[PDB]
């Protein structure tokens, strides 16, 4: 299980040397009083680390040097308790690459109306303290998330925690590696992209291996390791009796063991396969992909590493109780006028986290790629609102298209449909949302997620400086059309 907990966020308080050493300790004590009570709230998925109050420029750059060196650091929260002049922060901000969150707050809620004096205004320079700081950010063209509100309020705490999840989701991508077993499906364009621009912009390291490398590991698996997987399969899934149905289960278990060993040996965070190139593999890898995705490993099919990396990062985001992130492909539509829906599924690989029922193992005739009927997990989709994202390469840059959707319970049964399925409504209308998905050039391979909001992906794209286009409920098609071309030039030369 790869779940975030080790990542820490560096809370940063600012001051200057042109102050008395007595009032600085009051700021240090108050900052401890804020960050410790912040750690008392269980909403934050990671710890906070208060660092000594900064007064000179050299201290600023010294702390930022340590922020980029420690891999356990995945973000910095900056808050000006008092007036800290910004020209001290220039050299420090010109070196850091960790995401920034600008917390605008004052520790005391109300104003002591009868006791506000000049010795208190000198301490609580909150209003005009970071306004000068935000100028230096807007000036340096630096990407950051701004959040305003009193730290005791819940709304600001939710915003800063969502930013924490995103600020570490990019880190599980700068460190990790994406593995390709076979190249892209031939003549497919949306799955292709510039592998170097991903390392330069997103940080996603990406490499390709021949599938025979996997075929070496799938056969060299011990026999008493697949039975410990079969007892787990029985405790959670499994089809009737010992027939040819269980032969595919043992084959999928042997592939699962090979994949876990391989991805562990090469520090992987996501992987992708191809269905027309898996020789010496006795069967198309199914169920094992769902087993690896159930932990956290992102996956894309047909060579699509775009979707694999997006699914991995967006799975690092949605990691808590309302979890549910899967690799999706919009498969078919339901064109009734009043209740037009869309049924999403794949040929085999759908993550069992968005499942509503008991994940049921099934095997069915599947001639795609020409092997033996592979196993798969079957379940109905989850209810409620969700998001459907897709990153696609635009030649000179990447763009992230995201559609907010409302998933609905399945009304009718499907006896002959072998793969797990979800039904949802694209907001606002199927016609508008789908014609906007087509205008933006969104790929067919998407990242379905019920655990996160559009706020998450918006902070992801803001932190990585890539184009984002959202398809909210207030979607006006013509204004979205203008938005596409106005964005096309901003991200082209500037970034």
Which residue, 46 or 273, is less far from Mn ion as judged by CB? Answer: 273
User: Where does this chain touch Mn ion (CB under 5 A) — which range of 192-200, 215-223, 330-338, 464-472?
Assistant: 192-200
Site for a second copy in 454-483 (CB under 8 A): 458, 478, 482-483
User: What does DSSP say about strands 422-426 and 341-344: parallel, antiparallel, or unpaired?
Assistant: antiparallel
Which helix (H) or strand (E) covers residue 76, if one does? strand 73-79
Minimum separation from the CB atom of position 487 to a second copy (A): 8
Instruction: Give yes or no for residue 183 binding Mn ion (CB under 5 A).
Output: no
Minimum separation from the CB atom of position 85 to Mn ion (A): 11
Site for Mn ion in 410-469 (CB under 5 A): none
Nearest CA-CA partner of 207 in 292, 69, 64, 303: 303
Which residues, in sequence order, are CB contacts of 201 under 8 Å at separation 6+? 397, 398, 464, 465, 466
The footprint of a second copy on this chain (CB under 8 A) covers a number of residues equal to 140
The reply, when asked if residue 329 is annotated as ligand binding, is yes
Instruction: Give yes or no for residue 69 binding a second copy (CB under 8 A).
Output: yes
Distance CA 419, CA 349 (A): 8
Tokens of 294: 């159930």
Q: What mask of x and - would describe binding to a second copy in positions 395 to 414, judged by CB under 8 A?
A: xx---------------xxx
| Interacting residue with a second copy among 1, 21, 200, 265 (CB under 8 A) | 200
Nearest CA-CA partner of 379 in 412, 422, 347: 422
The footprint of Mn ion on this chain (CB under 5 A) covers a number of residues equal to 3
* 113 φ, ψ (degrees, to nearest 5): -60, -35
Query: Could you please report the per-residue DSSP string of 185-202?
Result: PTT--TT---HHHIIIII
| Interacting residue with a second copy among 437, 448, 456, 460 (CB under 8 A) | 437
Instruction: Give yes or no for residue 213 binding a second copy (CB under 8 A).
Output: yes
| Interacting residue with a second copy among 118, 264, 265, 321 (CB under 8 A) | 118
Instruction: Give yes or no for residue 329 binding Mn ion (CB under 5 A).
Output: yes
Instruction: Give yes or no for residue 132 binding Mn ion (CB under 5 A).
Output: no
Distance CA 129, CA 269 (A): 41
Which residue, 92 or 344, is less far from Mn ion as judged by CB? Answer: 344
Q: By the 8 A CB rule, do 306 and 300 touch?
A: yes
3-state secondary structure of 373: coil
Which helix (H) or strand (E) covers residue 318, if one does? none
Interaction partner, residue 42 (Mn ion, a second copy, none; CB < 5-8 Å by kind)? none
Give the torsion sign (CA, 6, 319, 303, 209).
positive
Distance CA 325, CA 97 (A): 27
Interaction partner, residue 385 (a second copy, Mn ion, none; CB < 5-8 Å by kind)? none
How remote is the C-alpha of 396 from its chain's centroid? 23
Minimum separation from the CB atom of position 299 to a second copy (A): 17
Minimum separation from the CB atom of position 309 to a second copy (A): 15
Query: Which alpha helices (H) appear in 43-183, and where do they start and end?
Result: 57-69, 90-93, 118-121, 131-140, 154-169, 171-174
Distance CA 60, CA 143 (A): 18
Site for Mn ion in 393-412 (CB under 5 A): 395
Which residue, 34 or 229, is less far from a second copy as judged by CB? Answer: 34
The reply, when asked if residue 445 is annotated as ligand binding, is yes
User: What does DSSP say about strands 8-13 and 73-79: parallel, antiparallel, or unpaired?
Assistant: parallel
Q: What mask of x and - would describe binding to a second copy in positions 140 to 169, judged by CB under 8 A?
A: x-----xxxxx--x--x-------------
The reply, when asked if residue 128 is annotated as ligand binding, is no
Q: By the 8 A CB rule, do 380 and 355 touch?
A: yes
Which residue, 130 or 329, is less far from Mn ion as judged by CB? Answer: 329
Distance CA 205, CA 179 (A): 9
Interaction partner, residue 243 (a second copy, Mn ion, none; CB < 5-8 Å by kind)? none
| Interacting residue with a second copy among 116, 243, 322, 409 (CB under 8 A) | 116
Instruction: Give yes or no for residue 68 binding a second copy (CB under 8 A).
Output: yes
| Interacting residue with a second copy among 2, 43, 127, 220 (CB under 8 A) | 127
Which residues, in sequence order, are CB contacts of 443 under 8 Å at separation 6+? 190, 191, 304, 306, 307, 390, 391, 392
Sheet holding 100-104, edge to edge: 47-50, 8-13, 73-79, 100-104, 145-148
The reply, when asked if residue 462 is annotated as ligand binding, is no
Interaction partner, residue 293 (Mn ion, a second copy, none; CB < 5-8 Å by kind)? none
Site for a second copy in 244-283 (CB under 8 A): 277-280
Site for a second copy in 337-396 (CB under 8 A): 337, 342-343, 364-368, 392-396
Instruction: Give yes or no for residue 21 binding a second copy (CB under 8 A).
Output: no
State the residues that interact with Mn ion by CB under 5 A.
194, 329, 395
Annotated binding-site residue numbers for Mn(2+): 302, 329, 346, 445
Annotated binding site: 302, 329, 346, 445
């Amino acid at each position: 299980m790869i779940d975030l907990k080790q990542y820490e966020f560096w809370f940063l308080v600012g001051s200057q040397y042109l102050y008395g050493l007595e009032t600085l300790k009051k700021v240090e004590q108050q900052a401890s009083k804020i960050v410790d009570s912040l750690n008392d709230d269980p909403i934050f998925p990671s710890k906070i680390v208060l660092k000594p109050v900064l007064k000179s420029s050299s201290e600023i750059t010294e702390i930022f040097e340590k922020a980029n060196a420690d891999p356990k650091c995945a973000g910095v929260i900056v808050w000006m308790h008092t007036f800290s002049p910004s020209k001290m922060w220039i050299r420090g901000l010109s070196i850091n690459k960790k995401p920034l969150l600008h917390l605008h707050t004052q520790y005391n809620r109300e104003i002591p109306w009868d006791t506000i004096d000049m010795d208190y205004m000198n301490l609580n320079q909150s209003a005009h303290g970071d306004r000068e700081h935000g100028f230096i950010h807007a000036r340096m063209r630096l990407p950051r998330k701004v959040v305003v509100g009193h730290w005791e309020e819940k709304e600001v705490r939710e915003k800063i925690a969502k930013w924490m999840r995103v600020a570490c989701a990019i880190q599980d991508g700068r460190m990790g590696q994406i593995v390709r077993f076979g190249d892209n499906m031939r003549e497919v364009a949306s799955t292709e992209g510039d592998k170097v621009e991903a390392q330069i912009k997103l940080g996603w390291s990406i490499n390709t291996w021949g599938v025979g490398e996997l075929a070496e590991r799938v056969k060299a698996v011990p026999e008493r390791e697949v039975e410990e997987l079969l007892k787990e399969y029985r405790e959670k899934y499994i089809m009737p009796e010992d027939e040819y149905s269980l032969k595919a289960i043992r084959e999928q278990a042997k592939i699962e063991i090979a994949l876990r060993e391989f991805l562990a040996a090469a520090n992987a965070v996501g992987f992708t396969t191809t269905f027309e190139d898996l020789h010496d593999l006795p069967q198309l890898p199914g169920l094992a992909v769902q087993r690896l995705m159930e932990e956290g490993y992102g996956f894309g099919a047909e060579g699509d590493w775009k979707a694999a990396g997006l699914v991995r990062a967006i799975k690092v985001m949605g990691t808590s109780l309302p979890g549910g992130t899967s690799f999706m492909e919009d498969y078919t539509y339901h064109l009734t006028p009043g209740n037009e829906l869309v049924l999403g599924a794949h040929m085999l690989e759908v993550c069992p986290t968005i499942a509503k029922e008991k994940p049921r193992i099934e095997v069915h005739p599947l001639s795609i790629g020409g092997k033996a009927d592979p196993a798969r997990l079957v379940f109905d989709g989850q209810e409620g609102p969700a998001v459907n994202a897709s990153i696609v390469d635009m030649g000179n840059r990447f763009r992230l298209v995201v559609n907010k959707v409302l998933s609905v319970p399945i009304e009718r049964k499907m006896p002959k449909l072998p793969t797990a399925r979800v039904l949802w409504k694209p907001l606002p209308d199927f016609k508008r949302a789908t014609t906007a998905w087509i205008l933006a050039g969104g790929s067919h391979h998407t990242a379905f997620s019920t655990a996160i909001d559009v706020e998450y992906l918006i902070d992801w794209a803001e932190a990585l400086e890539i184009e984002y286009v959202v398809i909210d409920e207030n979607l006006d098609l013509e204004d979205f059309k203008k938005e596409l071309r106005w964005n096309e030039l901003y991200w082209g030369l500037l970034k």
